């Protein structure tokens, strides 16, 4: 149905990879993105990890995270492109209404769920814009913090609960949302 976003089949033909093993699919996916220095690539188990993040992302699709430099705030937006394709877009908050060049997310991540039911695998590809002053390392650390706030990869510790509560408070417009606590919890090493 010539979708405006690329799905997994546009990168790896599904009808070609169906009898491959999980490891063989992972090799091909990493090879696909290997000739780049702007790319984030991962393979995530669905039930164990992505499913819980997905559930929090649908209910809480917008967030803010600091990028330590002072800190520069970033918007995080989850976009549900289709039943098998979920995007995470990260945009610098201060400049995004200044010009079309800054309005573009500096980091776009796709999660492909096409193999989730048969192989319990999610394939991730992201790109960081070379014109931005966000490095690949900065983008990696932001993605790690997205994971910590979005379900805190099933942690049940007090601080993990504090992170999830802050995410929910932001998305419901609660007075209890506080930027200072956001910054403390994003910088804290405890999981």
CA distance 176 to 186: 16
| Cα end-to-end span (Å), the chain | 42
Q: How far is CA 9 from CA 3, 46, 117, 149, 169, in A?
A: 12, 18, 16, 30, 37
Phi–psi pair at 163, nearest 5 degrees: -65, -45
* Cβ atoms within 10 Å of 144's Cβ, excluding its own: 10
CA distance 187 to 151: 17
Q: Residue 73: which domain range?
A: 1-191
Longest dimension (CA), the chain: 51
Residue with tokens 């804290």: 188
CA distance 99 to 51: 36
**Domain count of the fold of the chain:** 1
CA distance 140 to 178: 24
Q: How far is CA 19 from CA 15, 25, 112, 116, 117, in A?
A: 9, 9, 18, 14, 14
Q: Where are the alpha helices (DSSP H) in the chain?
A: 8-11, 14-17, 22-32, 51-59, 100-103, 116-119, 136-149, 158-171, 179-187
- Coil, strand, or helix at residue 77? strand
Residue 152: DSSP 8-state: G
Technique behind the model:
X-ray
């Amino acid at each position: 149905k010539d979708k405006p976003y690329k799905t997994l089949d546009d990168y790896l033909k599904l009808d070609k990879i169906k009898d491959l093993s999980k490891q063989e699919v992972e090799f091909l996916w990493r090879a696909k993105w290997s000739n780049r220095d702007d790319s984030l690539v991962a393979v995530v188990p669905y039930v164990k990890t992505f499913q819980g993040m997905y559930k929090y992302a649908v209910k809480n699709p917008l967030f803010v995270l600091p990028l330590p430099r002072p800190v520069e705030l970033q918007y995080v937006q989850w976009q549900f492109a289709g039943p098998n394709t979920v995007h995470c877009l990260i945009t610098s908050l201060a400049e995004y209404k200044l010009h079309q060049d800054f309005a573009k997310p500096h980091t776009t991540i796709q999660f492909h769920l096409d193999l989730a039911n048969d192989k319990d695998m999610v394939l991730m590809n992201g790109q960081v814009e070379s014109d931005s002053n966000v490095s690949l390392q900065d983008a990696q650390l932001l993605l790690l913090n997205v994971q910590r706030f979005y379900g805190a990869m099933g942690s049940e510790t007090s601080i993990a609960k504090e992170r999830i509560q802050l995410l929910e408070d932001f998305n419901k417009g609660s007075q209890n949302f506080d930027i200072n606590k956001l910054i403390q919890l994003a910088q804290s090493m405890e999981n």
